[PDB]
């Protein structure tokens, strides 16, 4: 039995795609978003009178096992040195595995930091964080 | 073994 | 055997656990049940309402 | 005054939720003590008390 | 109160089981995921008013033989106290209140009031269904009657409602002293047919889901939690094996007593007395 | 046996409703509230003489499993991009499941931040936080 | 819905097992890591259309003798509820929706619309394969038909598509009430030849990997998790031992019921009534 | 055997009372207190010469299971909205359960913050914190 | 066998005494001490040239189960309200249980803060912290 | 069976090399990297218009069991005292164990801090952190 009226996304249900290639062995993606909501106050009451949006901000963080080939460094999406200055913005798509249908798009991603951890009883881990210009979904 | 658990009619 | 008797079992008859060939004793809280007030058919027990 | 909603836009509504919704409408826009809601079948009759002017 | 989860479950399961089994399309919906022949055989045998077989419910350790074709065995399990209040004060009351009740009733006119009559003295009124009164309506409760002003409401002179309320025992003060317990009961659907055991499992899970909304386990017996065992032979050395799949139902509930307080104080009095040293 | 004289709310006892629809698969709601209580001190004693209320503040935070349909983004309550500027305030109701009776109302909610976490052994989680203008209950 | 993981697994494994075994190069790829003679012997015995031996699948506790040369025994295991919703509201719907379906269909011209016909009434359309319509295309769904404007699309007058959609039961409101359960099923490949047991293990792991992409366990039965036991003699005192290696398949899934709501409200009405005090 | 020469208070031994009603289902009370003790230093030694008390401060924090009736909001001790401005100070008494004898009094309590947490496998929890003017015991 | 050449103090070996009475049911005592050691640096090297002591500071913190009698409040050592202004400094002695011989003396203790926690499955806990003027041992 | 199309690095797969000698008993290496990505905002919208890279930073941290010989102090890479002023920059290579092929190079490493922990039930641990001028990979 398979029902649509209730369903949740799961780690197996969702592809992560960059430039039309799926990202293998991605372990997590974390999207965070903030609007700077500021409350308005005045003489005459302690209550907030209004809220205003002032500054949009958001980041996408991805953890991945470091493959022997097609790393973020080998794919060119990450940067180790001054060549960060020569990487154009990229769009990261999170896509439904069954329907191949875009769930959410992060547009204009730009790398904040890049980590690699080499450890003796574990698989090596990449982690990367991007600032992005906006996010959207289409249906 | 005796027929306790499932019990069926006599043949006639 | 023992059964609690309810409106469904009155209307439908109690399906007996055993294949009863004959009854040697039958009774209730009110006393013995007389043979005009019970019947067995198809290994179902029917009782006066 | 009128504000009205129709057309299956809601689930599992109750007389209490109606009364709060009206006060949300009025609070953003008269006392909650002064209004009554009766729900029956598909109808919700909302009744407001009002104070006409008596002469002394 | 003191409570008995096993007797609650027996009392609640038996009528619900009967009312599902007398209603064919409910079973046809519950068993939609099973194999077609399993579904149709179960529905033919046990379901509908003409059903020649029957299911049964009862506690473990009876002295007689049971209907091993299909029988829900209820089996009281472990428990432990989990959360305590300061001073063990679970609550306090100014008026000894009984069980919660829901009753259907109709309005009637009486002396230019509308009134609803209830079978028992109203200790507290929680809700009159589908009505919220204004202050103008002059809502009052008295004894076992709810009363409601007629003047503006004449259209409702025969309005039909459900009253949710609770009994009063007596006018007395006290402290509800007690604690919370987490307690388990096991239920197993015995059948010598494995496909019947699997269907009885499905029906029981449906019944428990439906039970979660009942007032009994909304007010008490909260946080129903279900666990499921393997399907296995319960008895193995008859002319045939008897199978079942256990389920464990765990509930959180309050055990408590009404400690009444006889002491009452109704006047302070003041006096000045003079110290001449 | 069912007694009213003692009873506590539980996860099963309480519906969460927005715009007259129940929010499916909500995992938690956390309401927080602050009045800015400031103590008054003076020359002549170390004791506080008085307390005054100066600034009301409060937030409602909701965690939810990301459904395949009727997300906060699909319902429109959340915002992914600049369209946050076009969302009017909404009222969030917490309602008794048995009586359908309002327990507490949060009025004038406005989104502070919105998160989604995609992870490989778990169901995807939405989380959202709103500032609100006031809260009330009616009985 | 209520669900039965064991019957799902039986229904899903049997056709997949048949379709792999009738296809030699698939087995030749699956067994590439085994010893050459093991691989060739398995492929000779069980594989291809001419295969004289056969594999079999069924539940435990049959009353008859099985094909102990190679048999997948399916064995329903434990489970427990894991995550609950507030109010137990798993979802809500304005229109009672059935199972998800995928069907092949072809466009046809009708009255200067293109239409796709589907075998059942469309409760919701999820995707028309390889098409994204513009507003100009005037996409509409009606009954069991999808309809699509002809004018600009004449080249596609016989276009072949797959429709992903879901049934509707009826036009009614309600709440999907239920919870999530995590549940285990064991599967073991019995053979009196140890090398056959090892090959049946490999084939079963391949089948389960392939199963992860199916709509059934994408929409339900999510988060498949596999555990593997030792290889051991299951029975030890025949004329020969019977060997097997258990695997445990664990699934997370929803148990729920459609609680329909009959109450509907279609007009508010307002009245002012005057208080003369 | 029951001895007075050693005895400690315990969760079962102590009632919490507000306005002469016991608070049902209270889970904890935490009383904290500070005097601002400041050390005096001078040219000529590294040692502190003296300590002085400069500012008294204290709070009482109470956690409680949210009952269906007689909440802090229903009792009126808590405030959800602007009506906080209309709540007079209240005195909280901690009382010996056996002797009905006051152990400690917190005088002039005034609410700092109020929380409710709604969660799916748990009983709902109230928590409240008050600033108070002084504390005392009488014997 | 009992040897002096190695021995460590333990919770059972040590009495805590205030004003010549042992403190019953004390659960811990923590003594902390600081000298303000500041390093001297100069043009011409990165190395520290010298260290200087500039400001002595120390505290003694005591946790205790709240007895029904002879609390720190009943003993008068703690203060709940303004009467803190009338408590003279006290000396706290930590004493060898066998020899009745003073291990360390904290002189001129003065209370910083005082806590009580009332909780439902536990014994009630007092905790108190003092600043002190100096510490010493005598042998 | 051995496949290249998927493979991840692991603690056993990777050599760490300094000056052409492998570092024995290295327990972890952690490489971190930051670009100072700053968002550009303006009057007229809340959205970020652009992101700019402003300041590269990175560190390599290595934990190692303290050998009896060829410590970082004995190798001379670490410094205990003023002789830090006489250590030239060094390049740290992370190298594929199978192919002897450089995975990533950290160039111009310079020590920030150096730790040793001596503990009674454990092997002694060195830890060192370097700032580096750049990182690169070659293929």
Question: Which one-letter DSSP state was computed for residue F98?
Answer: T
DSSP track, E239-259: SS-EEE-EEEEEEEEEEEEEE
The counts of H helices and E strands in chain J are 1, 10
User: Does an H or E element contain J49, and which?
Assistant: strand J45-52
Q: Please name the residue that has the structure tokens 């149709």.
A: E40
> Would you call D36 and E159 a contact, using CB atoms and an 8 Å cutoff?
no
Residue of E nearest to G276 (CA): E136
Q: How far is H82 from chain I (nearest CA, A)?
A: 31
Task: Name, in order, each residue with C-beta under 8 angstroms of G161's C-beta and a sequence gap of 6 or more.
Answer: G104, G105, G106, G107, G116, G128, G129, G130, G131
DSSP track, D1-56: ------SS--SS--HHHHHHHHHHHHHH---GGGEEEEEETTEEEEEEEE------
Please tell me the distance from the alpha carbon of residue H36 to that of residue G114, in angstroms, as a whole number. Answer: 82
> Would you call G265 and D43 a contact, using CB atoms and an 8 Å cutoff?
yes
Calculate the dihedral angle through the C-alpha atoms of G260, G261, G267, G273, rounding to the nearest 10 degrees: 180
- The encoded tokens of residue A121 equal 């009883």
> Would you call E131 and D16 a contact, using CB atoms and an 8 Å cutoff?
no
Please tell me the distance from the alpha carbon of residue E224 to that of residue F11, in angstroms, as a whole number. Answer: 11
> Would you call B2 and E192 a contact, using CB atoms and an 8 Å cutoff?
no
- In chain E, residues with a C-beta closer than 8 Å to the C-beta of I118 are 86
Please tell me the distance from the alpha carbon of residue I75 to that of residue E168, in angstroms, as a whole number. Answer: 49
End-to-end CA distance of chain E: 57
Asked whether the beta carbons of G200 and G227 are under 8 A apart, the reply is: no
User: Does an H or E element contain I102, and which?
Assistant: strand I102-119
Q: How far is B8 from chain E (nearest CA, A)?
A: 12
**Inter-helix orientation angle G36-46/G194-211, to 10°:** 80
* Angle at CA of residue I8, ends I7 and I9, nearest 5°: 130
Asked whether the beta carbons of D18 and D3 are under 8 A apart, the reply is: no
**E88 touching F (Cβ < 8 Å):** no
Q: Please name the residue that has the structure tokens 């069976």.
A: J1
> Would you call D50 and G173 a contact, using CB atoms and an 8 Å cutoff?
no
Q: How far is F130 from chain E (nearest CA, A)?
A: 28
- Least Cα distance to A66 among A14, A115, A21, A109 occurs for A115
**Inter-helix orientation angle G194-211/G5-21, to 10°:** 110
Q: How far is C44 from chain E (nearest CA, A)?
A: 10
End-to-end CA distance of chain H: 26
User: Does an H or E element contain I51, and which?
Assistant: strand I45-52
Please tell me the distance from the alpha carbon of residue F90 to that of residue A53, in angstroms, as a whole number. Answer: 15
- In chain A, residues with a C-beta closer than 8 Å to the C-beta of F65 are 8
Residues in chain G: 277
Q: Please name the residue that has the structure tokens 């593997």.
A: G228
**Parallel, antiparallel or unpaired: strands I125-131 and J21-22:** unpaired
Query: Quick count: other Cβ atoms within 10 Å of Cβ G273?
Result: 14
Size of the E and G interface in Cβ pairs below 8 Å: 64
> Within its chain, how far is the Cα of F83 from the centroid?
22
- Resolution attained, angstroms: 3.6
Size of the E and H interface in Cβ pairs below 8 Å: 47
Mutate one of D9, D44, D53, D55 to test the G interface: name it (highest G CB count within 10 A): D44
- In chain E, residues with a C-beta closer than 8 Å to the C-beta of F101 are 127
- In chain H, residues with a C-beta closer than 8 Å to the C-beta of F10 are 122-124
Query: Quick count: other Cβ atoms within 10 Å of Cβ A26?
Result: 20
> Would you call E218 and F13 a contact, using CB atoms and an 8 Å cutoff?
yes
- Least Cα distance to A84 among A122, A53, A128, A123 occurs for A128
Q: Please name the residue that has the structure tokens 């901690």.
A: H94
Please tell me the distance from the alpha carbon of residue E194 to that of residue G60, in angstroms, as a whole number. Answer: 10
* F51-56: long-range contacts, CB 8 A cutoff, minimum separation 24: F51/H89, F51/H108, F51/H110, F51/H131, F51/H133, F53/A46, F53/H84, F53/H85, F54/A46, F55/A41, F55/A46, F56/A46, F56/A47, F56/A48, F56/F134, F56/H81, F56/H82, F56/H84
DSSP-based helix, strand, coil % in chain A, nearest 5: 5, 55, 35
Please tell me the distance from the alpha carbon of residue I69 to that of residue H17, in angstroms, as a whole number. Answer: 21
* Angle at CA of residue A17, ends A11 and A20, nearest 5°: 150
Please tell me the distance from the alpha carbon of residue G181 to that of residue G255, in angstroms, as a whole number. Answer: 7
Q: How far is G76 from chain E (nearest CA, A)?
A: 6
Q: What does each C-alpha distance from J136 to C26, D17, J18, J98, J139 come to in angstroms?
A: 97, 64, 15, 20, 10
- In chain D, residues with a C-beta closer than 8 Å to the C-beta of E131 are 15, 37-39
Mutate one of G268, G271, G272, G274 to test the D interface: name it (highest D CB count within 10 A): G268
Q: Please name the residue that has the structure tokens 């806990």.
A: I125
> Within its chain, how far is the Cα of I3 from the centroid?
29
Task: Name, in order, each residue with C-beta under 8 angstroms of G117's C-beta and a sequence gap of 6 or more.
Answer: G105, G108, G144, G145
Q: What does each C-alpha distance from E126 to E212, E225, F99, F100, G4 come to in angstroms?
A: 20, 28, 8, 12, 41
DSSP track, J50-100: EEE----EEEEEEEEE--SSS-HHHHTSS-SSGGGGGPPPEEEEEEETTT-
Looking at the partner chain, which of D13, D28, D32 has a beta carbon nearest the beta carbon of F20?
A: D13
Task: Name, in order, each residue with C-beta under 8 angstroms of F97's C-beta and a sequence gap of 6 or more.
Answer: E213, E218, F12, F13, F14, F15, G87
Q: How far is I7 from chain F (nearest CA, A)?
A: 48
**I125 touching H (Cβ < 8 Å):** no
Please tell me the distance from the alpha carbon of residue G161 to that of residue E162, in angstroms, as a whole number. Answer: 54
Asked whether the beta carbons of E197 and E235 are under 8 A apart, the reply is: no
β strands within chain G, DSSP E: 56-59, 71-83, 89-93, 96-110, 113-117, 122-128, 140-142, 145-149, 160-170, 173-190, 222-228, 232-235, 242-244, 246-261, 267-274
Q: What does each C-alpha distance from H3 to G92, G253, H7, I65, I120 come to in angstroms?
A: 62, 58, 7, 17, 22
- Least Cα distance to J102 among J135, J133, J71 occurs for J135
Task: Name, in order, each residue with C-beta under 8 angstroms of E195's C-beta and a sequence gap of 6 or more.
Answer: E38, E41, E42
Please tell me the distance from the alpha carbon of residue E252 to that of residue E138, in angstroms, as a whole number. Answer: 40
- Discontinuities after residues in chain I (C–N over 2.5 A): none
- Least Cα distance to E234 among E77, E76, E66 occurs for E66
Please tell me the distance from the alpha carbon of residue J59 to that of residue E118, in angstroms, as a whole number. Answer: 78
Rg (C-alpha) for chain D, rounded Å, is 14
Handedness of CA G60, G64, G69, G71 (dihedral sign): negative
- In chain J, residues with a C-beta closer than 8 Å to the C-beta of I45 are 82
What's the burial of G63, exposed, middle or buried (CB within 10 Å: 0-12/13-18/19+)?
A: exposed
- Least Cα distance to F24 among C36, A56, G86, E209 occurs for G86
Q: How far is G159 from chain D (nearest CA, A)?
A: 37
Please tell me the distance from the alpha carbon of residue E250 to that of residue E183, in angstroms, as a whole number. Answer: 6
Q: Please name the residue that has the structure tokens 């959360």.
A: E83
Please tell me the distance from the alpha carbon of residue E188 to that of residue F88, in angstroms, as a whole number. Answer: 53
Asked whether the beta carbons of E148 and E206 are under 8 A apart, the reply is: no
- In chain I, residues with a C-beta closer than 8 Å to the C-beta of E85 are 120
**Burial letters for F6-16: b for 16+ Cβ neighbours within 10 Å, e otherwise?**
bbbbbbbbbbb
- Least Cα distance to A112 among A57, A74, A67, A34 occurs for A57
**Inter-helix orientation angle E36-46/E194-211, to 10°:** 80
- Least Cα distance to A50 among E205, I126, F89 occurs for F89
> Would you call A11 and F118 a contact, using CB atoms and an 8 Å cutoff?
yes
- The encoded tokens of residue G85 equal 């919703």
User: Does an H or E element contain E163, and which?
Assistant: strand E160-170
Please tell me the distance from the alpha carbon of residue G205 to that of residue G215, in angstroms, as a whole number. Answer: 19
Q: How far is I55 from chain H (nearest CA, A)?
A: 5
The counts of H helices and E strands in chain G are 5, 15
Mutate one of E84, E91, E102 to test the F interface: name it (highest F CB count within 10 A): E91
Q: What 3-state class would DSSP assign to E88? A: helix
- Least Cα distance to H10 among I122, I24, E89, I115 occurs for I122
- Is chain G in touch with chain F: ≥3 Cβ pairs within 8 A? yes
Q: G175 - beta bridge partners?
A: G92, G259
**Parallel, antiparallel or unpaired: strands G160-170 and C38-41:** unpaired
Q: What 3-state class would DSSP assign to G16? A: helix
Please tell me the distance from the alpha carbon of residue B5 to that of residue E193, in angstroms, as a whole number. Answer: 11
**Inter-helix orientation angle E5-21/E194-211, to 10°:** 110
Half-sphere exposure of F32 (CA within 13 A, CB side): 8
Task: Name, in order, each residue with C-beta under 8 angstroms of E68's C-beta and a sequence gap of 6 or more.
Answer: B5, E190, E191, E192, E242
Half-sphere exposure of G64 (CA within 13 A, CB side): 4
Q: What 3-state class would DSSP assign to J41? A: strand
Please tell me the distance from the alpha carbon of residue E109 to that of residue F85, in angstroms, as a whole number. Answer: 55
Task: Name, in order, each residue with C-beta under 8 angstroms of H96's C-beta and a sequence gap of 6 or more.
Answer: H13, H14, H15, H102, H103, I68
> Would you call E86 and H15 a contact, using CB atoms and an 8 Å cutoff?
yes
Residue J83 — φ and ψ, nearest 5°?
Answer: -65, -5
* Angle at CA of residue D40, ends D36 and D46, nearest 5°: 25
- Least Cα distance to F23 among F74, F80, F88, F98 occurs for F74
Q: What does each C-alpha distance from F45 to H38, H54, I82, I112, I130 come to in angstroms?
A: 16, 9, 9, 17, 22
User: Does an H or E element contain E12, and which?
Assistant: helix E5-21
Asked whether the beta carbons of A108 and A133 are under 8 A apart, the reply is: yes
DSSP-based helix, strand, coil % in chain G, nearest 5: 25, 45, 30
- Is chain I in touch with chain A: ≥3 Cβ pairs within 8 A? no
Please tell me the distance from the alpha carbon of residue E134 to that of residue E154, in angstroms, as a whole number. Answer: 16
Please tell me the distance from the alpha carbon of residue J27 to that of residue A80, in angstroms, as a whole number. Answer: 23
Residue of G nearest to E197 (CA): G76
C neighbours by CB contacts (3+ pairs under 8 Å)? B, E
Residues in chain D: 56
Please tell me the distance from the alpha carbon of residue E252 to that of residue E222, in angstroms, as a whole number. Answer: 5
> Within its chain, how far is the Cα of D51 from the centroid?
17
> Would you call J85 and I47 a contact, using CB atoms and an 8 Å cutoff?
no
Residue H25 — φ and ψ, nearest 5°?
Answer: 60, 20
**Parallel, antiparallel or unpaired: strands G71-83 and G56-59:** parallel
Instruction: List all residues of chain H from 3 to 32 with a beta carbon under 8 Å from chain F.
Output: 24-25
Q: How far is E259 from chain G (nearest CA, A)?
A: 33
**G37 touching D (Cβ < 8 Å):** no
């Amino acid at each position: 039995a398979s029902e649509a009226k209730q369903t949740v996304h799961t780690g197996n249900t969702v592809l992560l795609m960059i430039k039309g290639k799926p990202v293998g062995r991605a372990q997590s993606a974390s999207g965070q978003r903030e609007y700077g909501t500021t409350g308005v106050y005045e003489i005459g009451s302690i209550m907030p009178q209004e809220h205003v949006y002032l500054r949009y901000e958001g980041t996408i963080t991805v953890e991945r096992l470091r493959m022997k080939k097609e790393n973020f460094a080998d794919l060119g999406y990450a940067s180790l040195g001054e060549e960060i200055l020569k990487k154009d913005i990229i769009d990261i798509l999170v896509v439904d595995n069954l329907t191949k249908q875009v769930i959410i798009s992060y547009h204009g991603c730009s790398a904040n930091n890049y980590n690699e951890t080499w450890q003796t009883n574990e698989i090596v881990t990449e982690e990367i964080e991007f600032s992005y210009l906006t996010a959207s979904d289409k249906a | 073994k005796r027929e306790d658990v499932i019990v069926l009619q006599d043949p006639y | 055997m023992i059964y609690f008797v309810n409106k469904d079992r009155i209307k439908k008859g109690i399906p007996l656990y055993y294949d009863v060939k004959e009854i040697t004793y039958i009774a209730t809280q009110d006393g013995t049940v007389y043979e005009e007030d019970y019947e067995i058919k198809n290994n179902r027990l029917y009782l006066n309402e | 005054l009128e504000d009205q909603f129709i057309g299956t836009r809601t689930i599992n509504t109750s007389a209490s939720i109606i009364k709060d919704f009206i006060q949300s409408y009025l609070g953003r826009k008269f006392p909650a003590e002064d209004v009554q809601v009766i729900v029956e079948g598909n109808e919700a009759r909302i009744s407001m008390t009002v104070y006409p002017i008596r002469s002394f | 109160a003191i409570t008995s989860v096993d007797s609650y479950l027996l009392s609640e399961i038996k009528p619900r089981l009967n009312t599902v089994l007398e209603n064919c399309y409910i079973i046809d919906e519950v068993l939609k995921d099973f194999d077609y022949q399993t579904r149709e055989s179960f529905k033919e045998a046990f379901c509908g008013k003409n059903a020649q077989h029957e299911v049964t419910v009862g506690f473990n350790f009876p002295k007689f033989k049971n209907n091993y074709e299909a029988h829900y065995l209820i089996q009281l399990g472990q428990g432990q106290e989990t959360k305590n209040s300061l001073g063990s004060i679970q609550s306090s009351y100014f008026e000894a209140t009984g069980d919660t009740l829901v009753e259907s009733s109709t309005a009637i006119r009486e002396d230019d009031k509308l009134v609803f009559t209830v079978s028992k003295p109203i200790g507290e009124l929680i809700k009159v269904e589908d009505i919220e009164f204004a202050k103008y309506d002059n809502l009052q409760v008295e004894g076992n009657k709810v009363s409601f002003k007629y003047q503006t409401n004449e259209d409702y002179e025969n309005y039909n409602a459900n009253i949710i309320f609770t009994e009063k025992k007596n006018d007395s003060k006290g402290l509800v002293k007690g604690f919370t317990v987490e307690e388990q009961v096991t239920v197993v659907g015995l059948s010598f047919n494995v496909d019947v055991a699997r269907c009885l499992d499905a029906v029981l899970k449906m019944i428990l889901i439906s039970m979660r909304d009942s007032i009994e386990e909304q007010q008490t017996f909260q946080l129903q939690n279900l666990s499921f065992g393997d399907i296995a032979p319960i008895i193995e050395d008859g002319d045939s094996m008897i199978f079942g799949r256990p389920t464990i139902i765990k509930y959180t509930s309050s055990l408590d007593l009404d400690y009444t307080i006889t002491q009452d104080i109704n006047k302070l009095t003041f006096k000045e007395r003079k110290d001449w040293k």
